[PDB]
Amino acid sequence: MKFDPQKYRELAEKDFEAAWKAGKEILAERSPNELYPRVGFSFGKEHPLFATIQRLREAYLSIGFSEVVNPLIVEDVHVKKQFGREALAVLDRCFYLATLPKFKELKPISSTLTLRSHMTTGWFITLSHIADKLPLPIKLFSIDRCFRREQGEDATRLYTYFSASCVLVDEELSVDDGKAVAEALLRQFGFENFRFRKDEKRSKYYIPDTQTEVFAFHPKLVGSSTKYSDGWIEIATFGIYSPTALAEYDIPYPVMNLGLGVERLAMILYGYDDVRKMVYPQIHGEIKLSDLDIAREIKVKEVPQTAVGLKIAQSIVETAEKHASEPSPCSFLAFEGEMMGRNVRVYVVEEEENTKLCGPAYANEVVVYKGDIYGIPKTKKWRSFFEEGVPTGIRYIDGFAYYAARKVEEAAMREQEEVKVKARIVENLSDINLYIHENVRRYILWKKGKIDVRGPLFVTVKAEIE
Amino acid sequence: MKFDPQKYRELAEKDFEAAWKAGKEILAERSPNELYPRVGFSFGKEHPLFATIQRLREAYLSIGFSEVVNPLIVEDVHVKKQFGREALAVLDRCFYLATLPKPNLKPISSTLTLRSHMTTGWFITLSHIADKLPLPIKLFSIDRCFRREQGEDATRLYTYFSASCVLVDEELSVDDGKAVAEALLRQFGFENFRFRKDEKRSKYYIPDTQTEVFAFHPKLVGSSTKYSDGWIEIATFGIYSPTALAEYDIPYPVMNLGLGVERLAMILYGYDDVRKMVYPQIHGEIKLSDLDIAREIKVKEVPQTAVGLKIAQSIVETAEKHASEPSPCSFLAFEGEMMGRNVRVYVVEEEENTKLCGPAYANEVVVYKGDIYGIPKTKKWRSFFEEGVPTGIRYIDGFAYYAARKVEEAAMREQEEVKVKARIVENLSDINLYIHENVRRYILWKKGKIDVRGPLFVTVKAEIE
Amino acid sequence: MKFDPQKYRELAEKDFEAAWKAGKEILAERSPNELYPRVGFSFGKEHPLFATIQRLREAYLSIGFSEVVNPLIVEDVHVKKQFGREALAVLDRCFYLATLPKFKELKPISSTLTLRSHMTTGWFITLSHIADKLPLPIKLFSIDRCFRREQGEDATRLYTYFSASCVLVDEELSVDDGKAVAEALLRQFGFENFRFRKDEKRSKYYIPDTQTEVFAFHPKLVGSSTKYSDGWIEIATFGIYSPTALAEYDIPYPVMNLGLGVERLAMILYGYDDVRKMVYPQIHGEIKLSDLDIAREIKVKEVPQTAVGLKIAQSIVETAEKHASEPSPCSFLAFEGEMMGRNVRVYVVEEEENTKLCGPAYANEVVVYKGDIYGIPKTKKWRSFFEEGVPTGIRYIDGFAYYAARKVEEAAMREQEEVKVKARIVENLSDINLYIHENVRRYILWKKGKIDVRGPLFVTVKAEIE
Amino acid sequence: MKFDPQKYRELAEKDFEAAWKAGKEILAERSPNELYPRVGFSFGKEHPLFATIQRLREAYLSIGFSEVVNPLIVEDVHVKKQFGREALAVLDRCFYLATLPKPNLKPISSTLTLRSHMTTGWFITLSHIADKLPLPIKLFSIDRCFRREQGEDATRLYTYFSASCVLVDEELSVDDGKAVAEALLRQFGFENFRFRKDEKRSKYYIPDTQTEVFAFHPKLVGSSTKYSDGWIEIATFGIYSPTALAEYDIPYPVMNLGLGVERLAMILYGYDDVRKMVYPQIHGEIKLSDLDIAREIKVKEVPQTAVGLKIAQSIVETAEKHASEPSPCSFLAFEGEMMGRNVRVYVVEEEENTKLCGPAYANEVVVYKGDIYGIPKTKKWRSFFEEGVPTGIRYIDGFAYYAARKVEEAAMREQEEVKVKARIVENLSDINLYIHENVRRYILWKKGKIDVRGPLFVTVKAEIE
RNA sequence: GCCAGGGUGGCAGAGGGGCUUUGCGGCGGACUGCAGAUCCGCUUUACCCCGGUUCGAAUCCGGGCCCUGGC
RNA sequence: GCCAGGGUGGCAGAGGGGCUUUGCGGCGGACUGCAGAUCCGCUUUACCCCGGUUCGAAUCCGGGCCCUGGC
């Protein structure tokens, strides 16, 4: 609550300790669902692919390459100009844009247009307009989507993917330029060593013998459940465009092209093994809450609506903790004072005999651990659950005590003169006045986790209002 | 050059002042083409589309939304499940993927479509989580979409970027959309918002929730465009219709807001034509600055010898003061030895009535607004000299280097005497300067001009002993 | 509210239009304080200094310099080693660290320790440990705080400040290296042209004649209320460290040092003219809300707590708009239905005669504009206010109507049989059932802005419950 | 090299296959020191402290807090207004600023102090806004603080970075602090939190609000440190006491959370000693990789002529197969002309019983774990060859270049015959290789070794006609 | 840094060795009023900081800052 | 891509031309019970996709995918 600067200055200057100890008055007194972990700020997370793409952007930028957007939709006449005869085997792995003619009848009519199968198809077009018109060397990059049909599968390969590519245009170029660029780039993503082998594919658009495959060594990978056990993985490729191809676009200068698969680099930088689970987690049921998250989701259902009632609840737990061993039958006044224009007396009791006030589980605490919600007691048997899971800070009596106080509160509204609520055996969270949204309940089942809140609460509260 | 600390330590515990002035001996002596601005670092420049995308990724994150990647390639049955009746239409604006049959031709269409808007992918994505994650759910995604519009590029482009988000919760209203729109747009500097109901009342959104958002950005008022009052339509949103949602087993309202990246990036980076902003190479937008072109203007022939330079420096020297003398006359500029052969360097003129040096000997090469000029440093030209970039190379300079190098060629061939002249400058070559074919080919393309002319009329004589 | 996937699928497949038009049921019906602009998400803004420092970090990184932290607290023996005799005039502008000896007695005892007056004092120390031990050239930078007492002022200069400095260590160096580096850096912050003049200060730690001052041309500045009218401003300096100084630390190689004032570059990149107002806005009363922000802060005080009551309020405005011209006296039933276990009749009226039901301002709307809150009517006289300020979307009758409905709601609780609330003349927001937090009210006064909500509302509501 | 498109266009409309194989003529022919890894780009690496600061600036922004700059230099009366009684103490840990009096000496202290914690600056900053801005107010600041601790650097450092925030509102509790702590720490990968009351109950926070926050980070379990169970104290917070607040006319509770950057950055980047993480130069942490040192191993003398190379390539060639032949013997490696003078190049050996080439002629120079080795490619060495970086230069190579260049020196001096030998390699020089003084001085400093040894025993004979 | 007029209450604005403005504005309040009102009550009695002069200084003097007509 | 055993309900698990498992689990419910229970009710009657065989296929055949003992 707010307070008075002057009053506190004038009292603190005379009796500082008083003022200080009094500061407590300005703090908010919280009802159960307003207490950490039940309260929390949140923040947006970012997807591993896009994190990687942005990193890659900064990687190429820092080594002097400039950003560019190449043509994505291209007349397949360009694959023919770039591959020669091999051209027809490349277009078999491509997609053609088809449209709908000018109702329920209509059917897609293919066209000549394609969706680039790789950044190269467009580098040519883009380079043709500026290779002889810009100061040399020209260093450009583009990280963007491409398409390539893959044996009609999502498992053998996704249909779309990102390629982080670049091009170096200079008068004098050797394969040592791709190597120099491959290293200056990967070394920023943590790789420490590199090996370059010649690609047996020897593609028509690359000067023969320049098409190199690049292997990098990454620490994170060493001793990994994968095959990249030794830390080495093929992470990129490159070459020097053929003059035959450059001609078809009238490019007079030699051009080094080095590109890389973004999906794979993300899998490495963020620890994934299944490309599809990495980019499409939701769709592949790869969702997950943390114990912390689930604990925050366990809420108290019935809660006293009066400052008086909160006290009443406090008192029932207060006096239940003390006299939790008084053999039955007994009774104690937990709270007496007035609420809602009338005096009230609330008592903790046990009617049955040959036992004690509170059952042997009244003090059990609800704690989340490795995905399940347990209703357990702080025993040297549940040490791990309490030291590793996250304790909700609610015990059976706590949940009950709030139930009770809400009841006696409702009574003193319905004018009634007496109300006595009692808890017997606990089968589930409901019996402890504790709930969780229907979505969290489904996440838990979907995830094959359990709710295990059971026990002998046997706690009774008698109230008499006037 | 490297030095010795003790030397300087003691060499100055004695007399500081001289030790200090001595330091200059450690500085590199630069030959003409190793001098600013002919030397410089460069760096990557990013593209405005992508910068904007990134700015949006951050803008969505700072307001709670987590990033997701939505299905791009989709069976057209999804568009049918989401639009219902009007679906027949909607599909005429999408593309379908076709493929070449494995002959033992013509591409054979399939039932797969490229998403025309992000919504097609959102329902799919949400069906796996909307019932198992704590509410609210706030997801977003800036990604590519494909749309055929008539079949023109001035109308719109085939591919574009959508920056959109979904907001799953138990109780939503058109107000949640407005709130989000503001939180996101305020971060790009928009100051005021106005919402209006979008007439097209699409069937995928609850009736009357589809809203069009207008925003006032200060950059825009005064705009050489029609956003002159500063307002512009920049986004749209709606709450999905349970008709569509129910098709995916999503049991809660879902707000969907989205905004076109291209329009935003054009506002932010100041572009008027989308295709010029996105594909500036393909649309002739290449652009070197003045400082960049100056950087490219180099001295063609330079003296390799240490004395080769001390020479041209003198040729340029004496001919600077005695440039005015009348013809004929001749001053001795240099004398010493190179390639182990003592020589004498002379600045001269033979003809009569004229003078030693033409009147353009001290004209400096300077770049301004894309053109390379060769002009004298007169008040008539201050603007060019003070807002353009002066190459630092004058007509004599360009020359004195060609001279001092031609004598170095005399000594190499045992020869005994050589005399190279200089009269009328019709260009850069004539002044011993060049620019690489690509920058020349650039200056042409950008319809720019080189104007290096003038009366140099300065001759050099030297004979190697 | 949530809904049923199956029920909606099975009805939409048969009668799509029905389902669709029915979708409206799942939308939340909002009470007045839950309507935009009264609702809004927010986000953290960043300070111009730190934005700039981070930009500068990326600027040096992209041009191949590496990050370093230099010594900030230094034995003044280092100024003596670096400046020679000029050393004592440099330490007069410095701060010495003083401590408190080992109560109320105690007094600070100076020491030999200083707080670097510039990044240079520390570059020497840092460079001594690695100039001969690392591959050449060495490119390092550091953007960090420095101190320099300035004639006992905050106006003539702040005592602390950031310096974004760097060093180039190579065997061969000329002043053309500082120029090349000054440009590759500034060109990233938008400057397009540069001029370098020799600094008359000719400082002892720089090889004579190398200490260059750097002037850059920036567009943003052209035609500016400043002196940088022409777009040129001195933005950095540089030099080549003296061998005399390098020796004192045993540095054998030549070193180029170029640094820059971060505060000034921020002022340019974010449009400020007073350094102190830029870094310490709060302290200099430079705070500010937007009309949008203030509009969001105008809340409705008394609000119906029953779905029934919201309707009642809706009806009073409903029937007040229609019959707002019926000469007095008159009366109309606005709403009749039951609320809280009893039937209720609410009427709009005017008891006085020779006028009409509603006053001539009942429809005035509260709109924020250029900082003041106005209670005005959509007249071709207030076009600008409505087209430029931000309309709250609340008019006198709206605020009142909610008051009323809350009253009749309270009545039907106190069992009462009749209640009649009436609005006469409006002097302020209070009279329209509209408030603003005490802080926003103070911001408005502090900012010298006004609240101008006046007018003849004269609206009456009679209710009769049973 | 540049080429002609028509040439290749037609030159292949005829026979593609050959036009393709022809392209290789456009590739640059690289001399030894222009080959990978002797060539490479480099780039700036950022410092872990500053990266962490930046990561925190983002972390605070994504949770609502706006950035502010707080007063650093402050009159000690503020510490007195905020701590009250215990203020006497608190000031003994701060520094005071002293200055030299303008003689017509010793520094004269003033009453100004460098802030030891961020709180000293927060009250000042908040007094101007806590009553005039809409609540809540959420501010933060990652900046420098000064603190004397005993007078040791192993204990703590004099300066450090504080990442802190304030949260002004009408109703706060210890819960707001925990919530914020989680929102901020979760973004650095901490998964579980435990809060405990800080015993020191400082007077600037309401009694019993001062909390110590412990967080579980997965990197930390297994930790070669004592955070082995993964938990660590990483931040602290409290709600200010109105005793302090009232001194500034702030009428609302204020939550203050703060966390040390240095500890966080050490966790994130894996450092055990703060001063080694912050000042790695001053504490000998310089570190070149293997690939970086390989890059620095260069061929000292290289043949300038085009044929100068075609030569050494052959010297290296024939001596590769016929390396095994017994002594004496002699093979003709090259014959053609350079500097316009036909010559013959021979690989030979005179002595007896031995062989042409020593047995270490094919030893490759490779870098591994900081040391430069000269070893043969045997299974005994795979680990070195497969995890280190092979310079690509073998003993003969290093040599054949020295040879082919010594004959180029024979032709330059009109001479007619020269013969250079090669026996026992005691090092890098002996194999015609060098590393710059700085990398050598580095390898020493990092107590690393160079091991270039072996029986080369290979001699070259050639006579220029 | 050199000559000079000067630093008054939230804004404004005269003034002047002791009491002393005034306007705007504000906030509290009253009203049979159908439009931006009317009226009563309201300040921390305000005159930068350090010295001097005096019984007394915002008013006088010295200095030091703070705006300037400035060189 | 080549040989072969094969793809059963949320998990598990036999089976087999028509009816047909079963265990775990779940959810709904009852209880005088002081600790993780007891009992009644509960499935979309489940057997990948396209053809064939048949009056009838999850059960038979051909093909196509999906795990494999694989070359």
Name the DSSP letter for residue D70: -
CB atoms within 10 A of CB D430: 20
Map residue D67 onto helix, strand or coil. Answer: strand
Chain E bases closer than 7 angstroms to a protein Cβ: 26-27, 31, 33-37, 66
DSSP D184: H
Nearest CA to C422 among C458, C386, C370, C447? C458
CB of A449 nearer than 7 A to strand F: no
Instruction: Return d(Cα A408, Cα A400) in angstroms, integer.
Output: 12
Q: Residue D370: left (phi > 0), alpha (psi -120 to 50), or beta? A: left
Q: Which residues make Cβ contacts (< 8 Å) with residue A350, sequence separation at least 6?
A: A326, A328, A329, A330, A356, A357, A358, A458, A460
Question: How many CB atoms lie under 10 A from the CB of residue B17?
Answer: 11
Q: How far does CA B152 lie from the centroid of its chain?
A: 28
CA atoms of D442 and B222, how far apart (whole Å):
61
Q: How many CB atoms lie within 10 A of CB B79?
A: 24
Give the DSSP H/E element, type plus range, for residue C60.
helix C48-62
Q: Go through chain B and tell me how many residues it has.
A: 465
Token pair belonging to A320? 């239940």
Residues of B in contact with A64 (CB under 8 A): 42-44
Q: Which of A134, A141, A438 sits opposite B438 (nearest CB)?
A: A134
**ω before C5 within 30° of 0 (cis)?**
no
By Cβ distance, the residue of A66, A100, A129 closest to B45 is: A66
D454 φ/ψ angles, rounded to the nearest 5 degrees: 145, 165
Would you say C109 and C120 are in contact if contact means Cβ atoms under 8 Å apart?
A: no
Picking from B397, B399, B416, B398, the residue whose alpha carbon sits closest to that of residue B465 is B416
Report the sign of the C-alpha dihedral through residues B36, B42, B47, B51, in that order.
negative
CB-CB neighbours of A87 under 10 Å: 17
Are the CB atoms for C459 and C397 separated by under 8 Å? yes
**Cβ count near A90 (within 10 Å):** 20
Q: Specify the pairing of strand C138-147 against strand C160-169.
A: antiparallel
Q: How many angstroms separate the CA atoms of A369 and D220, rounded?
A: 20
- Report how far residue A408's alpha carbon sits from residue A96's, in angstroms, rounded to the nearest whole number: 73
What φ, ψ does residue A417 adopt, rounded to 5°? Answer: -105, -20
Alpha carbon of B184: minimum distance to chain A alpha carbons (Å): 14
Give the Cα separation of A108 and A115 in Å (integer).
16
C350 touches strand E (CB under 7 A): yes
Instruction: Please report where in the chains the tokens 């006289």 appear, as a residue.
Output: C381
- Rounded Cα distance between A273 and A286, Å, is 13
Residue pairs between chains B and D whose CB atoms are closer than 8 Å: 3
The residue numbers preceding gaps of C to N over 2.5 A in chain A are 102
Alpha carbon C257 to its chain's center:
36
DSSP state of B93: G
Strand, helix or coil at B296? helix
CB A157 within 8 A of CB A249: no
Phi/psi of residue A252, nearest 5 degrees: -75, -25
Sign, CA torsion C292/C293/C298/C304: positive
Among C191, B44, D241, smallest CA distance to A64 is for B44
Q: Please tell me the class of the C47-287 domain.
A: alpha beta
For residues D116 and C120, the answer to whether their CB atoms sit within 8 Å is: no
Helix/strand/coil (H, E, C) string of chain A? CCCCHHHHHHHHCCCHHHHHHHHHHHCCCCCHHHCCCCCCCCCCCCCHHHHHHHHHHHHHHHCCCEECCCCCEEECHHHHHHHCCCHHHHCCCCCEEEECCCCCCCCCECCCEEECCCHHHHHHHHHHCCCCCCCCCEEEEEEEEEECCCCCCCCCCCCEEEEEEEEEECCCCCCHHHHHHHHHHHCCCCCCEEEEEECCCCCCCECCCCCEEEEEECHHHCCCCCCHHHCEEEEEEEEEECHHHHHCCCCCCCEEEEEEEHHHHHHHHCCCCCHHHHHCCCCCCCCCCCHHHHHHCEEECCCCCCHHHHHHHHHHHHHHHHCCCCECCEEEEEEEEECCCCEEEEEEEECCCCCECCCCCCCCEEEEECCEEEEECCCCCCHHHHHHCEEEEEEHHHHHHHHHHHHHHHHCCCCCCEEEEEEEEECCHHHHCEEECHHHHHHHHHCCCCEECCEEEEEEEEEEEC
Distance from residue A241's CA to nucleotide F2's C1', rounded to whole Å: 39
Return the SS3 of D65.
coil
d(CA D442, CA D436): 10
Q: Are C56 and B283 in contact (CB under 8 A)?
A: no
- Rounded CA gap, D302 and D316, in Å? 14
Residue C155 backbone phi and psi in degrees, to 5: -90, -40
Four-residue CA torsion sign, D24, D25, D30, D31:
positive
* In the block, residue with structure tokens 């397949």: A76
Element (H, E) at D239: strand D229-239
Quickly count: other Cβ atoms within 10 Å of residue A30's Cβ: 16
The residue type at B137:
I
CA pair distance C342, D335, nearest whole angstrom: 120
Q: How many CB atoms lie within 10 A of CB D96?
A: 22
The helix (H) or strand (E) run that includes residue C462 is strand C455-465
Of C71, C132, C440, the CB nearest to D134: C440
Instruction: Report the residue of C62, C66, C141 to disrupt the A interface, i.e. the one with the largest count of A CBs within 10 Å.
Output: C62
Q: Which residues, in sequence order, are CB contacts of D388 under 8 Å at separation 6+?
A: D290, D366, D367, D368, D369, D373
Give the closest residue to C148 by CA, choosing from C90, C202, C97: C90
Å: A283 CA to F20 C1': 37
Across the interface, of A72, A99, A103, the residue whose CB is closest to B96 is A99
Q: Which two three-digit tokens encode residue C290?
A: 């937007």
Residue C411, both tokens: 């009545």
How would you classify residue C121: left for phi > 0, otherwise alpha for psi between -120 and 50, otherwise beta?
Answer: alpha
Q: A359 beta carbon < 7 A from strand F?
A: yes
Residue A167's DSSP bridge partners are: A140, A257
Please report, as a single letter, which amino acid is at residue B379.
Answer: K
Q: Compute CA B249 distance to the chain's CA centroid, rounded to the nearest angstrom.
A: 49
Contact B87, B116 (CB under 8 A): no
Contact D379, D447 (CB under 8 A): no
User: What are residue A125's phi and psi, to 5 degrees?
Assistant: -55, -55
Calculate Rg over the CA atoms of chain B. 35
Supply φ then ψ for residue C363, to 5 degrees.
-105, 5
CA–CA gap between residue A184 and residue A206 (Å, rounded): 22
Q: Which helix (H) or strand (E) holds B264?
A: helix B261-269
DSSP state of D38: S
Alpha carbon distance B37, C195 (integer Å): 11
CB neighbours of residue B18 within 10 Å: 10
- Chain B residue numbers with beta carbons less than 8 Å from the beta carbon of A73 are 158-159
Question: Chain B partners of A102 at a C-beta cutoff of 8 Å?
Answer: 92
- Of the CA atoms within 13 Å of residue C319, those in its CB half-sphere come to 20
Angle (nearest 5°) at CA D34 between D28 and D37: 120
Measured distance CA(B315)–CA(B460) in Å, rounded: 8
Looking up tokens 């045992």 gives: B414
Q: What share of chain C is helix, strand, coil (3-state, %, to 5)?
A: 30, 25, 40
Nearest-nucleotide field for A459 (CA, C1'): F34
Helices and strands (DSSP H and E) totals, chain D: 15, 22
Domain boundaries, chain B: 1-27, 28-41+287-465, 42-286
List, in order, residues 6 or more apart from D148 with CB less than 8 Å away.
C99, D93, D94, D95, D158
Chain Cα centroid distance, residue C384? 25
Spatial distance between the Cα atoms of A67 and B48, rounded to a whole number of angstroms: 9
Residues 6+ apart with CB under 8 A from D277: D48, D49, D262, D265, D266, D269, D271
Is D1 in contact with D26 (CB distance < 8 Å)? yes
Burial class (CB in 10 A: 0-12, 13-18, 19+), D29: exposed
Give residue ranges of A with CB < 8 Å to any C CB. 61-62
Domain D42-286 has CATH 3.30.930.10: yes
Hey, what amino acid is at D121? G
Encoded amino acid at A224, one letter: S
Q: What is the resolution of this structure in A?
A: 2.8
Distance CA C309, CA C316 (A): 11
Specify the 3-state DSSP secondary structure of C216. Answer: strand
The answer to whether the beta carbons of residues A254 and D1 sit under 8 Å apart is yes
Is cis: bond before D37, omega within 30 of 0?
A: yes
CA–CA distance, D3 with D229 (Å, rounded to integer)? 65
Give chain C residues 361-380 with Cβ within 7 A of strand E.
361, 364, 374-377
Cα–Cα distance for residue pair C372/C429, rounded to 1 Å: 13
Q: How far is CA B260 from each of CA A69, B228, D158, rounded to the nearest angstrom?
A: 17, 20, 51
Helix (H) or strand (E) holding C196: strand C193-198
Experimental method: X-ray
The CA distances from residue C2 to A166, B130, B167, B175, in Å, are 50, 11, 14, 18
Structural contact between residues A18 and A11, judged by C-beta atoms closer than 8 angstroms: yes
Residue A198 Cβ < 7 Å to strand F: no
- Cα D421 to Cα D399: distance, rounded to the nearest angstrom: 9
Question: How far does A466 lie from chain C, in Å, by closest CA?
Answer: 21
Distance CA A56, CA A260 (A): 10
Q: Is the CB of C157 under 7 A from strand E?
A: no
Q: Quick check: B171 and B253 in contact, CB under 8 A?
A: yes
Cα angle B440-B441-B444, degrees, rounded to a multiple of 5: 85
Element (H, E) at D73: strand D73-75
Check the CA dihedral B328-B333-B336-B337 and report its sign: negative
**What is the chain B residue with the closest CA to D65?**
B62
Which H/E stretch holds residue C366?
strand C365-369
CA distance B196 to B180: 15
**Helix, strand or coil for residue D119?**
helix
Bridge partners of D139, per DSSP, are: D66, D166
Helix H or strand E segment including C21: helix C16-22
Residue A356 bridge partners (DSSP): A327
- Angle (CA) D144-D145-D149 rounded to 5° is 140
Rounded distance, CA B432 to CA B167, Å?
A: 68
Helix (H, G, I), strand (E, B) or coil at B389: strand
DSSP 8-state secondary structure symbol assigned to residue C362:
T
Under 8 Å between Cβ of B32 and B393: yes
Which residues is B334 bridged to in the sheet?
B345
